[PDB]
Amino acid sequence: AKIIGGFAVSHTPTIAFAHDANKYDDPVWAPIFQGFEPVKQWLAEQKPDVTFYVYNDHMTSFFEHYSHFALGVGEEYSPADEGGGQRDLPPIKGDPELAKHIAECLVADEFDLAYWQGMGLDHGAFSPLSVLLPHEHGWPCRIVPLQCGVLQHPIPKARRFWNFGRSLRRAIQSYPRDIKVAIAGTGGLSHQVHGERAGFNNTEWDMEFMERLANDPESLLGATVTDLAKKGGWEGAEVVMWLLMRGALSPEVKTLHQSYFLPSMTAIATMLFEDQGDAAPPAESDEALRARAKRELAGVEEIEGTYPFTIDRAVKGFRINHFLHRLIEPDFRKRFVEDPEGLFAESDLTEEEKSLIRNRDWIGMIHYGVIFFMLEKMAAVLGIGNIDVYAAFRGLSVPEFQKTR
Amino acid sequence: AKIIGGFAVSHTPTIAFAHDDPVWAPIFQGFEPVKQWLAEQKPDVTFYVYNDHMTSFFEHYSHFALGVGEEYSPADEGGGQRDLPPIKGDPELAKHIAECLVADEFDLAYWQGMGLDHGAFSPLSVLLPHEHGWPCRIVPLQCGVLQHPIPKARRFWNFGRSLRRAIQSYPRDIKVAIAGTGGLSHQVHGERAGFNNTEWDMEFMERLANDPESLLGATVTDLAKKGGWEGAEVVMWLLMRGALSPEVKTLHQSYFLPSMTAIATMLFEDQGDAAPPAESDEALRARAKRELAGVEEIEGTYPFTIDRAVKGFRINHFLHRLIEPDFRKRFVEDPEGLFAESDLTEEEKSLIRNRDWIGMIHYGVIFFMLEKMAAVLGIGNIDVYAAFRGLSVPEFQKTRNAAITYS
Ligand SMILES: O=C(O)c1cc(O)c(O)c(O)c1
Ligand SMILES: [Fe+3]
Ligand SMILES: [Fe+3]
């Protein structure tokens, strides 16, 4: 319920790479690292429970299917493979509950989202994180990653990133739980990493954009992709994610820190923002917001024989829904039947999940949090005609249940 | 550029799974009184609104996933690759619709090369002659109706409201049909599994056609209670109705409830426009192009727009698999055997084989696929940059404040 502040930081893989090579001591990289030191410190003192983390994936985990606002709702995240292997970093915990709360308020505010789990985080996330948080086995905090689809145009408008940040603030604030949340906007600043114009930077624009972001962010909201990429480089236009983190903060903020270094392709920059509360008590109340947020599933509880597939359910059921979803592959539905206890043994399903499938436990799996269309897959794959399932749901068997027409 | 009108139709899987009989015979040709209209009007494209049933959209799942690619094969739903011919898509129209939508502040998703499940194909091989190919091209709007929160009914409606005039402003004078696939009242889960309700179905069908704005307050509860949980997907129907005239003509209307799902059907015929729209079709086209207007004035810069992604897809998809240690190992060891197995045209092979960095960018490869390719080959980003600038690596490193290297 408590937004403590927000920070902005580049997510260049060079950060990740200078870190892993331990060039902390090296003449080029050394002062760039003390650039992060105030944010690193501020994070270790404030000790937020969760960092709501805004980044973009770089056609690693997001390519053939590519969304604008992709809220990670899973309980855990590992480093992606970007063609060199995963980096040596412990997985970092998610926060499905808060993700669920945010998901709800954001849809109430007519933002069309996407939800995702299981998939790695590429340099977009773990590059500056590996440097801002100690991780020699556990990350100090949890994350709710929002990956943004900023590479494939048309992408959302600048004003739309800002307005997302705005609703985002009040969702986070209205979360009825006593936690500290930090907000990160990552990417930028100036840089262009493709075509004959590769190499482009613009320190003048970088410094203008940051002071405006800090002290007059509504002034940026009219900026087109063309504006932002003419001043900032094509890939520099990803700084709209900075606009979103800024939109999640108090109108006025205390800029505790700013740093800037431009050794190579990327203007490596860092801002820390201290949140300053709400001046006036806001136009919708915390409780009215919580109301309007689950207004769509208000009363849904009193419809029994009904297990709505919401995010908590989806997370609870993620392992088994994913295993049963893998039936659409040929060599998986084929050993689903030729070697179940071999497919089971190499799985990461709990024993309870194996036996639920084993028993052909139809309403058991629905109860557990298995979505039916995964069963619809299982029944067809095991040859079991679909309305054997609908019968076992209600208690009846095929012939007695059949009676309705 | 002109919408001929929409058809609502259940995308029940048993319409197809078995079918391709005295009980189905009445619905079966309760289907052709919209089939007629598909054959005599012959729309150039059909904007098809359905939902994937956790086949193609699952681990990463979105609310309005616009299909932007050129061909769509049937999705293997576990019951194997259903024998149907690859239907064509419409990237040019898909691109244009995205721009109007994003300008009207609808957050989208884009996708390519993934199968359509029964939600599309099952009722398609039933409304459309699919002999050797399909009469029209398709723009598939895959909706995300299974995992709450999901967009409001209001939101579904307004999408269709934007969708309509996004299609009206498409500068090509072609004709577009609008499929509002889905429904009706059923429930295929829980022990409510078998719930139906037709004193609702009928009132829903009647109000959808003549007073649709009275459906813009139905919560999921109000919906799932009146129609079953999975029945609540009919907000998709509202989206489709969104894209048509405020006043319409019920050319047809089927119904008959066999097993689980109320198999309905509602042929609409678009009338004119109520009054001339508030924004002009030129003014819309301008506003949809405003974000990137003048981007061609930026030199050495190749925006990765939807057309570029479609153009670059095979080679971008192929380069993407470098993230798998098995693929990327063959890539290094026996590249030609990978090439031969691939579906890469002969120039796409050569671009990659020649390490032609600048060519790949010109062609449509997005940089971050090259960034991987560099790493796979144990060379770095700098080399790629230098190659773009047509400079040696030390001469390019000179243009930077410091000289670092990385992967
Ligand atoms: O070469 C770089 O500095 C660079 C590479 C990236 O892939 C990237 O996202 C970035 O922000 C910077
Ligand atoms: Fe990025
Ligand atoms: Fe459906």
Query: Atom of ligand 1 at shortest distance to CA of A238?
Result: 11
Residues in CB range of B227: below 8 A, 6 or more apart: B183, B184, B185, B186, B197, B200, B201, B204, B234
Residue A262 CB–ligand 1 contact under 6 Å: no
A97 and A220 share one domain = yes
Determine the structural domain holding residue A258 and report its residue range: 2-304
Task: Mark whether A111 and A30 lie in a shared domain.
Answer: yes
The residue from B186, B252, B317, B362 that is catalytic is: B186
B chain contacts of residue A197, beta-carbon cutoff 8 Å: 298-301
Is A264–B220 a contact, with Cβ atoms under 8 angstroms apart?
no
Structure-derived torsion over alpha carbons of residues A256, A262, A266, A268, reported in degrees to the nearest 10: -20
Do residues A195 and A288 both lie within one domain?
A: yes
Sheet holding A50-55, edge to edge: A253-261, A268-275, A2-9, A180-186, A50-55, A142-148, A69-72, A114-116, B60-62
Most A CBs within 10 Å, among B53, B323, B369, to test the A interface:
B323
- Partners of B46 in the beta sheet? B138, B177
A58 in contact with ligand 1, CB cutoff 6 A = yes
Tell me whether residues B404 and A307 touch, CB distance under 8 A. Answer: no
Residue nearest to atom 12 of ligand 1 (CA): A12
Do residue A280 and residue A139 come from a single domain? Answer: yes
Cβ–ligand 1 contact at A56 (below 6 Å): no
Task: List all residues 6 or more positions away from A36 whose beta carbon is below 8 Å from its beta carbon.
Answer: A9, A128, A131, A132, A259, A270
Whole-angstrom Cα Rg for chain A: 24
Q: What is the DSSP letter of A313?
A: H
CB within 8 Å of A329: residues ≥ 6 apart: B76
Residue in chain A nearest B256 by alpha carbon: A405
Cβ of A111 within 8 Å of Cβ of B114? The answer is no
Identify the residue among A64, A77, A87 best suited for mutation to test binding to B, counting B beta carbons within 10 A and taking the highest: A64
CB within 8 Å: A226 and B58: no
CA B104-A59-B108 angle, 5° bins? 15
A119 plus A251 within the same structural domain? yes
A218 labelled as ligand-binding? Answer: no
> CB neighbours (10 Å) of residue A281?
7
Say if the Cβ atoms of B190 and A311 lie within 8 Å. Answer: no
Task: Answer for the pair B407, A84: CB distance below 8 angstroms, yes or no.
Answer: yes
Q: Are A40 and A57 in contact (CB under 8 A)?
A: no
**Spatial separation of the C-alpha atoms in residues A365 and A379, rounded to whole Å:** 13
Instruction: Tell me, yes or no, whether A352 and A221 share the same domain.
Output: no
**Residue having the nearest C-alpha atom to atom 9 of ligand 1:** A12
In single-letter form, the type of residue at position B264 comes to: A
B278 and B308 together in one domain? no
Is residue B100 located within the same domain as residue B230?
A: yes
Cβ–ligand 1 distance for A354 under 6 Å, the answer no
- What is the identity of the amino acid at B242? G
Closest CA to A404 of B227, B19, B146, B195: B195
Among this protein's residues, is A65 annotated catalytic?
A: no
**Residue A145 with chain B: CB contacts under 8 Å:** none
Would you call A388 exposed, middle or buried from its count of C-beta atoms within 10 A (0-12, 13-18, 19+)? middle
Give every CB contact of residue A84 below 8 A, 6+ residues apart in sequence.
B375, B376, B407
Closest residue by Cα to residue A377 from A347, A333, A334 = A333
What is d(CA B307, CA B310) in angstroms, rounded to the nearest whole number?
5
In this structure, which ligand is nearest to the CA of A150? 2
A265 CB within 6 A, ligand 1 = yes
Angle of CA points A93, A96, A101, to nearest 5°: 140
Tell the burial category of B201 from Cβ atoms under 10 Å away from its Cβ (0-12, 13-18, 19+).
Answer: buried
Q: What is the resolution of this structure in A?
A: 2.4
CA A171/CA A106 separation, integer angstroms: 7
- Using a CB cutoff of 5 Å, list residues around ligand 2, an ion: A 56, 187, 238
Is A13 near ligand 1, meaning CB less than 6 Å away?
yes
Residues in A touching B401 (Cβ below 8 Å)? 262-264
Q: What one-character DSSP code corresponds to residue A81?
A: P
My answer on whether A257 and A344 are in the same domain is no
Instruction: Let me know if B148 is a catalytic residue.
Output: no
Choose among A73, A32, A49: nearest CA to A259: A32
Rg (CA), chain B: 24
How many residues are present in chain A?
Answer: 405
Which residue in this structure is represented by tokens 């903060």?
Answer: A249
Contact A110 B189 (CB under 8 A): no
Nearest CA in chain B to A304: B192
Mark yes or no for CB contact B105/A156 under 8 Å: yes
Q: Does the annotation place B198 within a ligand binding site? A: no
**CB burial class (10 A; 0-12, 13-18, 19+) of residue A342?**
exposed
Nearest by CB: A83 against B260, B322, B402: B322
CATH number at residue B40: 3.40.830.10
Report the domain count for chain A.
2
Q: For ligand 1, say whether the CB of A12 is within 6 Å of any of its atoms.
A: yes
Q: Is A135 annotated as a binding residue?
A: yes
Contact (CB<8Å) A83/B189: no
A vs B: CB pairs below 8 A: 341
Query: Do B151 and B230 fall into the same domain?
Result: yes
Closest approach atom of ligand 1 to CA B367: 7
Using CA atoms, how far apart are residues B222 and A299, in angstroms rounded to an integer?
Answer: 9
Neighbours of B333 (CB within 10 A): 9
Residues B228 and B120 in one domain: yes
Domain boundary among the residues A265, A280, A304 is at: A304
> How far, in Å, from the CA of B124 to the mean position of ligand 3?
14
Query: Which of the listed residues A280, A304, A328 is the one where a domain comes to its end?
Result: A304
A9 lines ligand 1 (CB under 6 A): no
Q: Which residues pair with B267 in a beta bridge?
A: B7
- CB-count exposure of residue A380 (10 Å: 0-12, 13-18, 19+): buried
Both A286 and A329 in one domain: the answer is no
Amino acid at position A58, single letter: H
CA-closest candidate to residue B111, choices B51, B61, B67: B67
CB burial of residue A204 (10 Å; 0-12, 13-18, 19+): exposed
CB B186 within 8 A of CB B196: yes
Residue A100: its H or E element: helix A96-108
- Substitution candidate for ligand 1 out of A58, A262, A266, A268 with most atoms within 8 A of CB: A266
What is the token pair recorded at A204? 């003048």
Which of A10, A24, A76, A112 to substitute to test the interface with B, most B CBs within 10 Å? Answer: A112
- Contact criterion met (CB below 8 Å) for A31 and A275: no
Find all residues with CB under 8 Å of B273, minimum gap 6, and list them. Answer: B245
CATH code at position B376? 1.10.700.10
Is cis: bond before A189, omega within 30 of 0?
yes
CA B328 / ligand 2 centre spacing (Å): 23
| Residue A390 among known ligand-binding residues | yes
Among A304, A320, A354, the domain-final residue is A304
Q: Which amino acid is at A300?
A: V
Task: Please give the single-letter amino acid code of residue B400.
Answer: R
